[PDB]
Subunit: 264 residues, 5 copies
Amino acid sequence: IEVLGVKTDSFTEVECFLNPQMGNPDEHQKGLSKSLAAEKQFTDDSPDKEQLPCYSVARIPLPNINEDLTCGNILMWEAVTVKTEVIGVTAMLNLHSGTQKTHENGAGKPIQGSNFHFFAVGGEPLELQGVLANYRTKYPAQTVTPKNATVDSQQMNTDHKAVLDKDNAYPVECWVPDPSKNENTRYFGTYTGGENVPPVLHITNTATTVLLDEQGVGPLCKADSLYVSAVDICGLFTNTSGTQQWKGLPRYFKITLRKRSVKN
Amino acid sequence: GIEVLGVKTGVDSFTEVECFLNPQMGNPDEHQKGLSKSLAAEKQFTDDSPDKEQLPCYSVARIPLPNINEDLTCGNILMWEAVTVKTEVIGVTAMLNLHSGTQKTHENGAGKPIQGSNFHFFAVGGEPLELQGVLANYRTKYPAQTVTPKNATVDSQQMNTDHKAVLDKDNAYPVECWVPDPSKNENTRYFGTYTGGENVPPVLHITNTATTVLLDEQGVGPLCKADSLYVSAVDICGLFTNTSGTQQWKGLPRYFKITLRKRSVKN
Amino acid sequence: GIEVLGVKTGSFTEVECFLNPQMGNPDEHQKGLSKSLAAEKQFTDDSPDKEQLPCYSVARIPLPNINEDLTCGNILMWEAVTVKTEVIGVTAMLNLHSGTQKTHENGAGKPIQGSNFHFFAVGGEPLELQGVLANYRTKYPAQTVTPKNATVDSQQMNTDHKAVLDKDNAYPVECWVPDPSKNENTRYFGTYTGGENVPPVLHITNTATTVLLDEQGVGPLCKADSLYVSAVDICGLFTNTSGTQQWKGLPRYFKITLRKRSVKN
Amino acid sequence: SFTEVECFLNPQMGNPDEHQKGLSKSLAAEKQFTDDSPDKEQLPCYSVARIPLPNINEDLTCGNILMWEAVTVKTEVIGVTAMLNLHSGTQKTHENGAGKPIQGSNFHFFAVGGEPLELQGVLANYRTKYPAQTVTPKNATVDSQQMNTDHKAVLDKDNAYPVECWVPDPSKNENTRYFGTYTGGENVPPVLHITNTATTVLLDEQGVGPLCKADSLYVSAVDICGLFTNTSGTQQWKGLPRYFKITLRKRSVKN
Amino acid sequence: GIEVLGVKTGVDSFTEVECFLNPQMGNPDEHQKGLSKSLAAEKQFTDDSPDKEQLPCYSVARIPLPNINEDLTCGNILMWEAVTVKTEVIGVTAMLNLHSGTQKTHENGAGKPIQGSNFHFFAVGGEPLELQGVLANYRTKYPAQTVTPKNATVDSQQMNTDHKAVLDKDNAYPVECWVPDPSKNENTRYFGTYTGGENVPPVLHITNTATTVLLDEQGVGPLCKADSLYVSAVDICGLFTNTSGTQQWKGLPRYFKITLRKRSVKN
Ligand SMILES: CC(=O)N[C@H]1[C@H](O[C@@H]2[C@H](O[C@]3(C(=O)O)C[C@H](O)[C@@H](NC(C)=O)[C@H]([C@H](O)[C@H](O)CO)O3)[C@@H](O)[C@H](O[C@H]3[C@H](O)[C@@H](O)[C@H](O)O[C@@H]3CO)O[C@@H]2CO)O[C@H](CO)[C@H](O)[C@@H]1O[C@@H]1O[C@H](CO)[C@H](O)[C@H](O)[C@H]1O
Ligand SMILES: CC(=O)N[C@H]1[C@H](O[C@@H]2[C@H](O[C@]3(C(=O)O)C[C@H](O)[C@@H](NC(C)=O)[C@H]([C@H](O)[C@H](O)CO)O3)[C@@H](O)[C@H](O[C@H]3[C@H](O)[C@@H](O)[C@H](O)O[C@@H]3CO)O[C@@H]2CO)O[C@H](CO)[C@H](O)[C@@H]1O[C@@H]1O[C@H](CO)[C@H](O)[C@H](O)[C@H]1O
Ligand SMILES: CC(=O)N[C@H]1[C@H](O[C@@H]2[C@H](O[C@]3(C(=O)O)C[C@H](O)[C@@H](NC(C)=O)[C@H]([C@H](O)[C@H](O)CO)O3)[C@@H](O)[C@H](O[C@H]3[C@H](O)[C@@H](O)[C@H](O)O[C@@H]3CO)O[C@@H]2CO)O[C@H](CO)[C@H](O)[C@@H]1O[C@@H]1O[C@H](CO)[C@H](O)[C@H](O)[C@H]1O
């Protein structure tokens, strides 16, 4: 999209709370995955959907701004800044409910281990690339995973292109944002691996991310729609029995937008 | 929110207020201030009734400010605007005591230092801090003398938008039940870091040279309603381990020094 | 050697590249992994297989020719100005169920972790290497380019060990490092972390850009209309149910912006 | 209008005997709250030195005088490489292995001011029976484990104020600049940087550095690097000297 | 000392020198260059006599610079001035060999990587680096062929100002005995980081885009006396662990790339 210079009614602000999609084994275990399996053979590994955390995504409708989309010059909503926040970090200070003792007489074991904290803001669905730890993994019916996985899907298999158009459908272990695309999206993620990794989570209402690219253009919202994507795997929760399930927390988005002139 | 006009400072347009806020970890008895009650583990999800003393709570103090004697009948008045804050965790060196009631790390070895999960948080606002409730266990039966999410549901372990509250009472709101609400708090600036893990080393910096500017994106700091300021804090440093192996949350006081200026607002 | 002149304005180009990792690939089914790793082999008889040895990844990217005559005193060359680069598939390691080893009874699988090395380079010619060995008496396998005539000093400085990254899946990571005494026409960046329990920390974003201009404002100049991207992304060790370990690698993406620069000829 | 003073400050870990300088006495554990009487040598203390400065005034009744003003400081922990000694009196990590390096809880701290550092007392155990030859919070109460504003003091004596009892007072210290970092945990790896290129500016928000009262400059330090583990498994704090290099300028003040 | 005058600019005013500095970890025999001798532990303070091969030493090289003065009988002269340095630890990827003489971490597992206490240090000066002696154990009986603090006393474990030296000899000054002296070194820039702990992960970055400026607060870089430049280094990466459990310090070479300019000075 060919963009024009900036104007100076011109602004709008939208909010969103996004629930995590860790699996939710039953009604009582929202924010969690099903117990995790281990030591499954590469040739016979069939994870349950509830064992697989998925990307969270919400399409946010923006106020109509064009009467006629055939006009040579139209206005689009341009995402300029975002404040974003992981919600409920203190909840993990509960070391008494269904926890596993660290030692005799001791407090319960805190949530810890591998984590992935990720967010994206774009004027389209996040564009994804497929990469698998095990290409022979038999993925459940209620998930969208890389079609026709091959030996190359554990490295680069360019055929595995997708978009994040469904909430609670695209497994995190299957997809990453595609850096060869996503011109109209800004995304940020950090993966930390290791069963003993301490979660480090910062909260504030003073941190802003500018969404303008190198030419000073933020994501341009197609069809007056804004897309917010998220993953916030905080780590593993350890049951008294020693079983473990992924723990996720909601993510808040506060996007500021401006009206931008574009060629049409 | 509140419509402000431009900045215009002269002589005696500034003021400075100080505050020491004690931690509210639980205080099992008079001899254990700054500590919680020993912590339980492995409680059934459907029958978990924590004691109030086991639950660290948010600290909050309302600081009165000098009366600017403004009559709220006119459309133009002056309000105190918080512009900067110096804040400090108090008594970090106290944890260098590894001999009092500690558990040795090994035979002939020194006592085990306070460590594990921690949460360090502070807020400055012209109103009480606005809170959102999130629970690890929505079926948790919280004690009478705590303010916790009302009518907790299945969704309270993720997003339940009904759980809105304000930090208006000290030693009442359990840290594990509440976080600052990012969808509100227009008139508050808050800052927090959570670290999880039983072996997490505390890292605490002290200095009198660090200043936090409280002005937002439009250059406006918290506007102090009713000539009052709110400071909030949590400083869970980690766990203290008793000789027996029992563990209790450790907290330290937090110091605030806020600088304010008179600002014109619409009324 | 090369004396630069003016830059063409108005003159730009962008090139992309996905580089597969070269960890060893023991068989068709195990790409991105090395072969089972050996330990405790004697110094005088250590003969590692090629599949046990991760290698440097490299791709030569062809660019358009800009000159009709190479006898002219002034000639145009492609100048790499910026690079966006990204490790691909970081989330794949959240698979803790496939062929993993339990951390405990009833527990999840052990995540990939341990020694890692993440490295990338952009240059107008192959990356220049210096050989250094942990064990100079190592018997390196066929189909690998390793330091020739390794001596006592190859465990420290042996300046005879000079090479160029001109072949993919051939130069073992453990034998070569980029040569800081050379590489005038290359920009390289690497981080080594050692320790069997080291957590991998991997960031992803499409908003991070590295400027490739040197102190004088000149980026890599692409000789023979060729751009070289080089990478190593050893993420750590994958632990099998049995406890056997193998290096894990991931692909790396490059997006390089180039401009036409006039140069003395 | 300028001057430069420099100082080396020995650590005050306790020094049980003349052969163990830089170390504390063996540390005790698992002592009762109501009967914990630590020896002075078991308690590391703040280091402090008053640095006399050239005299610049001849009449103190004047309404306008000159005071030395501290502008910058270069500071350095001294002897960090000494801990690469893993053979002397160390405990083996494993059969045939090297000795265990100093590690564990640490506290690195320095201050520059024109007065003694002002302290606030906070105690882990308010019922601790502190030994003679130490200055500790007087009349320690139930609230001394949190906020007890009666516990005010100044760092005016070297090897007297136990680190575990006192912190710099943020409600005061207008004429001092202090910086400290505490790390807790028995396995904490010491991380120590050295250079002669790092400078700290001591000017405050108004552009004024510490003003040296009575032509005196105070330098305060604590550098508990971690725990030294003896062969027997017995442990003692380890400290290192800190170097100060302060630049001062003449400033006019009301009087 | 040296009254510094104008900087020579433009044509024939700059030079560039490079250097690879081998590490001096001890070198037990010809097959173990880059390593120390197996390390001893639990030696009693009174009977501690370390071999030289067990003691990593500072690395140093004097780099001769082109003659700049045709006549040394002048009122003022030209000196080489070090302006910038690029420096690199060489061979970091060598430690990704976990199969040669290593100790497995577990059954069927890979070899234990090099890890533990590390010290990474470099210096650029127009003189030898000036050292202060500090000892962990002052009663340590240091071996022949090492320069260690003379007449070590009770105070050598803290501040003993008598222990002054200069790094004028390669593989002679034990790293555990000496640190750069911050009370001198006016004509040298030094940088080092010590990390202690037997499980500490080495973290080593490489690049040809990082430059350190050597100019001081006055805009003056090290002035090279007797047309000589001094590069100093220590790069203790950690401990190598043999199958048997014995451990030896590992070191790697360091590269230096220094840019110099001609400076006028009074003579
Ligand atoms: C070890 C134990 O059974 N603790 C239970 C505790 O019992 C009290 C005394 O224990 C300590 C401790 O936990 O080690 C002793 C410490 O010095 C105290 N620390 C401090 C800083 O004061 C702690 C601390 O006060 C509490 O834990 C705070 O909640 O208490 C114990 O010595 C004592 O036992 C004997 C006593 O020695 C003897 O003179 C007398 O004749 O009989 C006593 C038995 O009653 O009794 C103390 C009680 O007054 O009490 C708390 C409740 O107050 C808990 O029951 C605690 O057990 C843990 O409880 C946790 C949940 O709260 C969790 O379930 C753990 O698994 C339990 O071990
Ligand atoms: C220990 C075990 O066998 N777990 C299997 C689980 O069993 C369920 C209950 O176990 C817990 C647990 O894992 O500890 C109990 C916890 O309170 C729950 N935590 C939360 C936050 O809700 C978890 C959690 O709900 C699930 O793990 C999430 O998937 O489950 C167990 O107490 C219960 O016992 C029943 C018993 O089965 C029944 O015969 C008797 O009449 O009543 C008992 C009640 O006390 O059974 C629960 C299931 O009905 O079930 C899951 C499948 O839903 C798994 O089988 C799990 O075993 C692990 O499975 C992993 C892969 O999914 C992996 O293979 C591990 O190796 C297995 O241990
Ligand atoms: C295990 C042991 O006793 N080591 C002592 C060592 O013995 C030498 C050989 O051991 C190794 C080792 O430590 O594992 C073998 C490794 O492959 C070598 N590593 C490298 C990279 O070359 C190391 C290394 O060379 C040295 O450790 C460096 O000092 O040495 C050992 O195999 C050999 O023993 C047999 C030999 O197998 C056999 O063919 C022959 O017939 O008899 C030999 C017995 O002499 O001997 C090697 C030396 O000749 O030697 C050193 C001194 O040279 C130490 O004694 C070392 O023991 C440690 O000493 C430490 C202090 O230096 C400390 O006290 C530790 O507690 C001791 O274990």
